């Protein structure tokens, strides 16, 4: 009944994929027993939370409900919270506890500089009775002191083999068939976030479950994800580089209207396509990149859509003149 | 185990390396004893807290435990504290040598609420005969103007290269570590003035790979490799730079902010190209960084940054 994102959440260290380089390290740390303060950081949908919860459940077993405290971002997070709750949990020694407790701060990069200073002082004070674990998406918004105090662990995105294995395990445990190009388009659009994959899978499941036997074609995947198909990108680029102004404008308009295309993703795909052309001159590439970056920056502030579309067309056309 | 930064923390004022003017000022202060209220401002990890701690220790001698009140971000500093506890501590009778005084050391003064900083005014103005205050702050702008004006301001510049090198060489000699000059230069590079971070990176490298070498440091820092970023920023044909940025940096999950910061840091140290071209490349990288921080982080922005850098270098 619960969504796959919550259902297929791993419960052991073995059920994590594409992170062996960190799994062997955490297994060494748990067999040695010298587990220090940890920092897990990386792009979303990678397995930091799942890995740390599995590690806590493995180290503490049933005592997990007592010696493990999870805190999230901005839970009335003044300095008062770090003064009362975390400080009491760290300082207070349980009745029948041997070892140390664990306080896991999820998405803990949203702390102010004063809050991070309080946290670094706290972790410095009681570093002998408990160990902390800080999770982050961007490791550049944390004070270098807190970073230096613990050991870092970057979570590289999931490779193709890991996501393919996981979608295979999900497929065999569910009533769905998956076409060969479907998984290719899936891996190309997801960019390596397992959460988005597990979301879009159940989405297209509920979407095209009419006879319980329909095949998930690339059309339904591109619809549910809301991403264009590379053929349309090639066609619009061809129309821009070949036809005149009015026809290319009408083609761009109809392609972005009938399918619901944003100029941002369209420009991303267009520059991805242009990245592999055999351009004879160099000034064309420079002008193209500069003008397209300017268009994207201007779109980031929400100007007049038709004007930015005409500007995209003009930049692409005036760049290819040598 | 034990952190080197905690084990080799200077306890005597003379052992502090860095600013040569303010450390001699504090030396003469401890020699005389008539210390005024003082705010100590500066960038993180350059020796602010250790300085005031060593000053208090050397100034009070055997009475440090009874004549010093320290308040960091962990302790509660609201309205009730500054009104009751600090005031009852300032009035506390204590017979010290003729020149000494009780010391109140407030660390991370920036986190102290303005309304809380209000109460300290008369408490420190009235009892100045047997009590002196030392604030330690990163940015001296969050301190209210009255407290800003009542006390002497002491600025701490960021650490230079020779001072950090001397301290690291002292630590190595005391620890009998195998090293090389390029490894020490890599430590200086990844530190940029943070003595604490420099020592911690040194200890992490020694614990992880044993020998202090460039590849070891650059594998333990988890930052983009400076050599490959320099090659990206110095390639002749633009397509080589674009291919480098695409395959060697963008695929491995590096954050765009880290790429821009590493490009900034390496362009600062490119002592082979001219000075004006360095300044203009820094300008371009900074405009790209400002674009990145505003919410857009597309690969196209970094591509345009590289394109403009090449256009400048041509």
């Amino acid at each position: 009944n619960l969504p796959w994102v919550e259902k297929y959440r791993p419960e052991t260290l073995d059920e994590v994929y594409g992170q062996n380089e960190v799994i062997t390290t955490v297994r060494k740390f748990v067999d040695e027993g010298k587990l220090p303060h940890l920092l897990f950081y990386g792009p979303p949908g990678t397995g930091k939370t799942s890995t740390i919860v599995a590690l806590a459940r493995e180290i503490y077993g049933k005592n997990y409900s007592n010696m493990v405290l999870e805190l999230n971002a901005s839970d009335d997070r003044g300095i008062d919270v770090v003064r009362n709750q975390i400080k009491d949990f760290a300082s207070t020694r349980q009745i029948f506890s041997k070892g140390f407790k664990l306080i896991i701060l999820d998405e803990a990069d949203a702390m102010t500089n004063a809050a991070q200073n309080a946290l670094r002082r706290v972790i410095e004070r009681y570093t002998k009775n408990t160990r902390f674990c800080v999770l982050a998406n961007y490791a550049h918004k944390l004070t270098p002191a807190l970073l230096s105090r613990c050991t870092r662990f970057r979570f590289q995105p999931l490779p193709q083999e890991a996501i393919e294995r996981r979608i295979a395990n999900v497929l065999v445990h569910e009533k769905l068939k998956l076409s060969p190009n479907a998984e290719k388009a899936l891996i190309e659009l997801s960019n390596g976030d397992m959460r988005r994959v597990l979301n879009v899978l159940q989405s297209c499941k509920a979407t095209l479950d009419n006879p319980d036997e329909d095949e998930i074609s690339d059309d339904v995947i591109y619809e549910c994800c809301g991403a264009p198909r590379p053929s349309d990108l090639k066609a619009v680029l061809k129309s821009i580089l070949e036809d005149d102004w009015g026809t290319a404008h009408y083609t761009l308009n109809k392609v972005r209207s009938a399918k619901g295309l944003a100029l941002i993703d369209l420009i991303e795909g267009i520059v991805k396509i242009l990245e592999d052309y055999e351009l004879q001159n160099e000034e064309t590439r420079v002008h193209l990149l500069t003008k397209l970056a300017d268009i994207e920056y201007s779109i980031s502030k929400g100007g007049n859509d038709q004007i930015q579309g005409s500007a995209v067309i003009g930049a692409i056309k005036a760049s290819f003149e040598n | 185990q034990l952190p080197w930064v905690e084990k080799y923390r200077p306890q005597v004022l003379s052992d502090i390396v860095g600013n040569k003017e303010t450390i001699d000022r504090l030396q003469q202060i401890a020699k005389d004893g008539n210390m005024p209220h003082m705010i100590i401002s500066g960038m993180p990890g350059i020796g602010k807290t250790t300085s005031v701690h060593c000053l208090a220790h050397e100034l009070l001698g055997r009475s440090y435990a009874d004549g010093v009140l320290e308040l960091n971000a962990s302790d509660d500093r609201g309205i009730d504290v500054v009104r009751n506890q600090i005031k009852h501590f300032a009035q506390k009778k204590l017979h010290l040598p003729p020149g000494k005084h009780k010391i109140v050391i407030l660390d991370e003064a920036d986190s102290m609420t303005a309304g809380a900083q209000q109460a300290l005014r008369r408490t420190m103005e009235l009892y100045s005969n047997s009590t002196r205050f030392a604030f330690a702050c990163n940015q001296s702008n969050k301190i209210i103007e009255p407290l800003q004006s009542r006390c002497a301001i002491l600025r701490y510049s960021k650490l230079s290269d020779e001072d950090v090198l001397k301290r690291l060489l002292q630590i190595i000699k005391l620890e009998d570590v195998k090293y090389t000059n390029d490894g020490l230069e890599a430590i200086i590079f990844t530190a940029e003035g943070d003595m604490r971070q420099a020592i911690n990176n040194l200890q992490s490298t020694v614990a992880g790979h044993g020998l202090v070498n460039a590849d070891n440091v650059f594998k333990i820092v988890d930052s983009p490799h400076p050599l490959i970023v320099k090659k990206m920023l110095l390639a002749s044909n633009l397509e080589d730079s674009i291919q480098i940025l695409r395959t060697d940096l963008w695929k491995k999950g590096y954050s765009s902010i880290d790429i821009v910061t590493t490009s900034f840091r390496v362009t600062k140290n490119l002592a082979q190209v001219k000075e004006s071209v360095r300044l203009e490349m820094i300008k371009e990288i900074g405009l790209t960084h400002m674009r990145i921080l505003e919410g857009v982080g597309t690969y196209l922005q970094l591509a345009s940054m590289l394109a403009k850098i090449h256009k400048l270098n041509n």
Partner: protein, 254 residues
């Protein structure tokens, strides 16, 4: 199916008042040996345990072990309505979901029936391991309570130390320091005011102020309290009772 009648009413009153503040929800388990209860505070520092046999009661009958998880605040609210000359009686039947209390004195027809719901928690966790304590002592409850709530204003960390026949309670804070020193002595005329001390090794450890203040509130049970101190082990504060005891297990500090 469960019938448990007392001799007085103030007995259960002070029994509940003893640990009414430390925890809110508590499970009473009844078997042929009597009634057993064990709980822990939210901070997981103080472990309260209460055992009452089948002798302080007058009529006690039950077929199988039964568990009743109830709130202590509401139980005290109900229990505070009785006179000191009455007789309380716990009544329970098949499928226990509502406990019945009955106040009744034979001198006048006052049948006071009170039904109380049961909020179950299903968390027992009773585990008592150590039986060898390094040092033990026994002293009047009033003296210990006076000392602890006298030294509680100075600081929040009370230092207990058992030296060579010199029991010493120390406290140090911001307004000063306090030191209570008591030596053992036996009074032949009044053993109820004697100080018993058996020491195998000199002991020195610390405890929190608020935890001791919550412990000593169970001083109305007995006039004599027994302290058992031991390194690498929690300290034990025991209050005897005609048919059992109430014991607080406290975890020291660093």
């Amino acid at each position: 199916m469960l019938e448990a009648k007392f001799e007085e009413a103030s007995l259960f009153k002070r029994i509940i008042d003893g640990f009414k503040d430390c925890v809110q929800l508590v499970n009473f388990q009844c078997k042929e040996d009597g009634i057993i209860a064990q709980a822990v505070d939210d901070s997981r520092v103080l472990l309260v345990s209460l055992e009452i046999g089948v002798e302080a009661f007058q009529e006690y009958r039950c077929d199988h072990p039964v568990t009743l998880g109830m709130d202590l605040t509401s139980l005290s609210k109900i229990l505070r309505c009785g006179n000191n000359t009455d007789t309380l009686t716990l009544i329970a039947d098949n499928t226990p979901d509502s406990i019945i209390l009955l106040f009744e004195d034979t001198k006048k027809d006052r049948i006071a029936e009170y039904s109380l719901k049961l909020m179950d928690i299903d968390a027992d966790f009773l585990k008592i391991e150590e039986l060898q304590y390094d040092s033990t002592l026994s002293l009047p409850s009033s003296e210990f309570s006076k000392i602890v709530r006298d030294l509680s204003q100075l600081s929040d960390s009370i230092n207990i130390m058992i030296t060579k026949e010199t029991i010493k309670f120390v406290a140090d804070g911001d307004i000063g320091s306090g030191s209570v020193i008591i030596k053992p002595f036996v009074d032949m005329e009044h053993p109820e005011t004697s100080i018993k001390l058996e020491m195998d090794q000199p002991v020195d450890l610390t405890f929190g102020a608020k935890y001791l203040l919550d412990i000593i509130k169970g001083s109305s049970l007995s006039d004599r309290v027994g302290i058992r101190l031991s390194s690498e082990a929690p300290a034990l504060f025991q209050f005897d009772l005609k048919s059992g005891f109430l014991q607080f297990f406290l975890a020291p500090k660093f």
